[PDB]
Amino acid sequence: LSNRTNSRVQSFGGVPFYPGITLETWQKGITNHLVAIDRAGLPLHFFIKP
Amino acid sequence: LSNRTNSRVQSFGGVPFYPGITLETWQKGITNHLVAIDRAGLPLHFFIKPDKLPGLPGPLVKKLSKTVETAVRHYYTFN
Amino acid sequence: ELGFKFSVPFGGFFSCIMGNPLVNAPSLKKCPGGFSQHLAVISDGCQVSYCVKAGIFTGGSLLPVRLPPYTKPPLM
Amino acid sequence: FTFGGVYQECTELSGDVLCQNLEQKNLLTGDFSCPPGYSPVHLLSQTHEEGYSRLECKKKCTLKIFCKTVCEDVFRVAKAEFRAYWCVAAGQVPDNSGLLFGGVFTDKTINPMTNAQSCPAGYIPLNLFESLKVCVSLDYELGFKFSVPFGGFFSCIMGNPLVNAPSLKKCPGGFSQHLAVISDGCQVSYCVKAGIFTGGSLLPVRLPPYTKPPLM
Amino acid sequence: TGFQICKNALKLPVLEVLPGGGWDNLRNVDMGRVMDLTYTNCKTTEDGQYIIPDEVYTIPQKESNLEMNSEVLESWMNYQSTTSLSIN
Amino acid sequence: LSLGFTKALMDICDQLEKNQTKMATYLAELLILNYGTHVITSVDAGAALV
Ligand SMILES: OC[C@H]1O[C@H](O[C@H]2[C@H](O)[C@@H](O)[C@H](OCCCCCCC3CCCCC3)O[C@@H]2CO)[C@H](O)[C@@H](O)[C@@H]1O
Ligand SMILES: *[C@@H]1O[C@H](CO)[C@@H](O)[C@H](O)[C@H]1NC(C)=O
Numbered sequence: 001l002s003n004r005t006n007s008r009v010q011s012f013g014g015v016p017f018y019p020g021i022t023l024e025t026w027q028k029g030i031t032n033h034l035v036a037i038d039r040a041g042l043p044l045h046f047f048i049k050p
Numbered sequence: 051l052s053n054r055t056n057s058r059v060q061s062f063g064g065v066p067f068y069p070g071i072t073l074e075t076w077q078k079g080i081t082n083h084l085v086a087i088d089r090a091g092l093p094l095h096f097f098i099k100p101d102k103l104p105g106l107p108g109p110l111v112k113k114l115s116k117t118v119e120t121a122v123r124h125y126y127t128f129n
Numbered sequence: 130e131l132g133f134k135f136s137v138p139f140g141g142f143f144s145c146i147m148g149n150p151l152v153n154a155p156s157l158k159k160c161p162g163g164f165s166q167h168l169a170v171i172s173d174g175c176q177v178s179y180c181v182k183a184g185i186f187t188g189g190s191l192l193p194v195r196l197p198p199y200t201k202p203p204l205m
Numbered sequence: 206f207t208f209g210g211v212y213q214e215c216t217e218l219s220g221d222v223l224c225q226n227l228e229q230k231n232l233l234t235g236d237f238s239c240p241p242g243y244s245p246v247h248l249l250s251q252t253h254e255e256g257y258s259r260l261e262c263k264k265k266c267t268l269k270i271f272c273k274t275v276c277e278d279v280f281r282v283a284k285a286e287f288r289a290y291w292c293v294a295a296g297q298v299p300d301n302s303g304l305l306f307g308g309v310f311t312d313k314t315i316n317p318m319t320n321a322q323s324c325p326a327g328y329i330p331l332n333l334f335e336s337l338k339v340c341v342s343l344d345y346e347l348g349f350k351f352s353v354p355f356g357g358f359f360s361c362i363m364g365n366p367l368v369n370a371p372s373l374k375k376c377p378g379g380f381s382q383h384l385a386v387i388s389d390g391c392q393v394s395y396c397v398k399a400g401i402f403t404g405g406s407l408l409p410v411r412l413p414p415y416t417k418p419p420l421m
Numbered sequence: 422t423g424f425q426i427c428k429n430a431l432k433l434p435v436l437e438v439l440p441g442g443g444w445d446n447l448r449n450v451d452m453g454r455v456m457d458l459t460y461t462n463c464k465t466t467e468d469g470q471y472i473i474p475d476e477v478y479t480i481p482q483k484e485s486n487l488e489m490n491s492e493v494l495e496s497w498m499n500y501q502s503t504t505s506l507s508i509n
Numbered sequence: 510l511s512l513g514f515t516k517a518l519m520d521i522c523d524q525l526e527k528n529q530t531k532m533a534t535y536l537a538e539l540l541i542l543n544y545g546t547h548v549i550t551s552v553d554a555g556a557a558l559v
């Protein structure tokens with residue numbers, strides 16, 4: 001007999017994840033733990049203006 | 051009959067671990083017990099700069115940085 | 130128009146068994162001009178790549194807002 | 206120096222089960238070889254054995270009238286010899302055409318350049334031993350921002366040919382010597398410049414400046 | 422340069438992981454305070470969880486990684502033999 | 510820079526000014542022992558478990 005289970009969880013933002021958590025609890029827990037999931041910007045020299 | 055069980059737990063930060071603890075309890079307990087898990091820095095002679103030390107003149111702080119850096123080099127070479 | 134606003138200058142393809150014919154007829158595994166070389170796929174250990182300009186490719190985590198201006202701030 | 210890639214040849218000595226994952230083509234050539242201008246260097250050849258229960262079903266017909274399907278399982282010890290090599294620059298190879306070295310790691314060790322058991326972004330892992338993976342960079346800019354100068358490989362039986370033709374077990378120049386893997390008691394190591402490696406707990410922010418504070 | 426004034430007001434813990442300290446790159450151990458840490462402004466992380474000194478700023482990279490690997494191997498081999506002989 | 514680090518640096522500067530390079534190097538090595546080799550500019554607060 002041979003069992004092999006691999007679980008891998010990766011979270012950005014929200015409550016620290018633990019295995020028994022439900023997506024409901026996690027989704028209701030982002031109310032203050034929000035992180036930058038995408039960002040856009042401008043080159044530095046563009047802001048050195050008279 | 052032969053049984054052999056080995057458990058090994060290694061924790062950094064959070065509540066002190068005990069066997070009957072659940073990852074929910076451990077994850078909810080890091081609110082105040084956070085630990086440096088990664089760090090980056092700069093050589094200290096990089097901080098010995100004329101603008102960083104008002105009390106001393108520029109030519110002096112240059113020599114000061116030189117001697118500090120050579121002290122670091124000696125400290126590295128010995129070990 | 131949609132492609133022009135949603136594409137990148139393209140140099141051509143090449144595989145592990147046949148290189149790019151647009152090198153500078155010999156066909157080498159090298160992107161012509163300033164076109165950069167990025168991996169596209171690995172089919173059964175065979176490497177297939179593409180060539181795009183290095184000016185558009187970047188670190189990629191920060192999407193540029195590089196739209197206007199189309200010239201540096203002109204001096205007085 | 207220029208590192209043109211690696212390839213691990215696999216020879217089946219019994220059965221055809223082991224060499225389905227122990228073989229590694231060279232990335233640039235798509236075959237167990239080296240790119241033009243590169244001389245393959247014998248890194249290490251070792252044998253590996255593994256037992257497996259293969260199930261097979263056959264239709265036996267006796268007297269052309271008694272036909273029956275019989276399924277049987279056989280426990281065979283497949284043995285295969287893998288020979289891993291690496292492509293070093295033969296001479297003044299064109300620059301910077303080739304590949305870049307992003308460090309190596311095993312399932313039990315760490316990759317000190319990234320401090321992780323994985324390859325950096327834009328890097329591909331190539332199988333080199335039973336448990337050794339090499340991080341190779343195709344893009345030149347991404348490698349140059351994510352690589353370390355490479356000096357060569359050597360084993361416990363064959364030394365580095367770039368010593369200063371004798372092949373000694375020593376990193377040429379200021380290249381440092383760190384262990385890469387231990388295969389059946391044979392040490393395999395690599396050579397990288399000693400200045401980039403450090404204690405490793407603190408990742409120095411070595412980007413600017415490119416000059417010491419210029420005097421007045 | 423204490424933080425007790427801020428703690429009395431905000432009633433929050435102070436983030437205990439702070440940069441600006443010395444570091445012995447050989448022994449891999451913290452050494453001593455090089456930068457100056459002051460709590461004049463009673464600065465706080467945006468989420469209102471920790472009091473930080475005025476000389477540091479925090480990027481909120483709230484991330485979690487979980488790996489679980491389980492592997493069970495069982496082998497059972499059972500064998501019996503019965504030989505009977507009778508001579509009359 | 511902190512008060513103590515500045516004070517130690519001033520002491521080394523004064524010892525150098527006194528044209529006495531002997532205890533200058535000793536004082537510098539004491540600085541190395543007390544404050545280490547690098548200065549940490551960025552950490553990652555967090556936790557880990559195995
Ligand atoms: O059985 C004992 C062996 O079990 C494993 O090996 C496994 C291997 O990991 C698997 O890949 C293959 O089984 C494959 C089973 C089918 C292979 C033949 C294909 C058949 C399938 C049915 C239709 C005809 C073709 O060999 C064995 C038996 O499981 C391990 O190596 C080890 O525990 C031990 O040495
Ligand atoms: C693990 O093995 C058991 C038998 O002991 C089996 O019933 C089960 O499907 C396997 N997998 C998991 C995830 O339990």
Ligand SMILES: *[C@@H]1O[C@H](CO)[C@@H](O)[C@H](O)[C@H]1NC(C)=O
Nearest residue numbers: 051052053054055056057495
């Ligand atoms: C210990 O031995 C018992 C039999 O007495 C067995 O059922 C069990 O699987 C073994 N292991 C543990 C962890 O109990």
